Design a protein around this motif. Structure first.
Motif, PDB file in Angstrom:
ATOM      1  N   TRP A  33       0.867  -1.217   0.000  1.00 40.47           N
ATOM      2  CA  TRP A  33       0.000   0.000   0.000  1.00 40.47           C
ATOM      3  C   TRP A  33       0.891   1.251   0.000  1.00 40.47           C
ATOM      4  O   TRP A  33       1.607   1.505   0.949  1.00 40.47           O
ATOM      5  CB  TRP A  33      -0.882   0.001   1.250  1.00 40.47           C
ATOM      6  N   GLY A  38      -2.010   4.460  -3.940  1.00 39.20           N
ATOM      7  CA  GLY A  38      -3.335   4.126  -3.330  1.00 39.20           C
ATOM      8  C   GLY A  38      -3.763   2.733  -3.791  1.00 39.20           C
ATOM      9  O   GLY A  38      -4.934   2.396  -3.817  1.00 39.20           O
ATOM     10  N   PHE A  80      -9.394   4.768  -3.084  1.00 46.23           N
ATOM     11  CA  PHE A  80      -8.665   5.372  -1.931  1.00 46.23           C
ATOM     12  C   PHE A  80      -9.622   5.518  -0.742  1.00 46.23           C
ATOM     13  O   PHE A  80     -10.760   5.085  -0.786  1.00 46.23           O
ATOM     14  CB  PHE A  80      -8.114   6.748  -2.326  1.00 46.23           C
TER      15      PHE A  80
END
Length: 108
Positions: A33, A38, A80
């Protein structure tokens, strides 16, 4: 597989086990991540970050003789995050903030 305020709270107040769909920032970050990406819907097409650990010494959430505080993402799908964030403590007290870690209104 849950990402809703009351829904996550009920899950935790009843089963205590973090909803089967969350991950600690570390795991999310170490799994790949990255902010300038994102990436999430790809490696986890429907997962929400959350499950870290905090002592709340800053007194930003309810406390007592030794209090444990942890957070979790809310209202996420694939892409996101946003501003919906839930906060739950050792005692399972759950509070909610929709301004990106700004106002923590109590919900449970």
């Amino acid at each position: 597989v849950i990402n809703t305020f009351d829904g996550v709270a009920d899950y935790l107040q009843t089963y205590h086990k973090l909803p089967d769909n969350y991950i600690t920032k570390s795991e999310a970050q170490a799994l790949g991540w990255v902010a300038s990406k994102g990436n999430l819907a790809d490696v986890a097409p429907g997962k929400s970050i959350g499950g870290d650990i905090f002592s709340n010494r800053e007194g930003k959430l309810p406390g007592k003789s030794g209090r444990t505080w942890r957070e979790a993402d809310i209202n996420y799908t694939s892409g996101f995050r946003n501003s919906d964030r839930i906060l739950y403590s050792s005692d399972w007290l759950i509070y909610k903030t929709t301004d990106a870690y700004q106002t923590f209104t109590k919900i449970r």
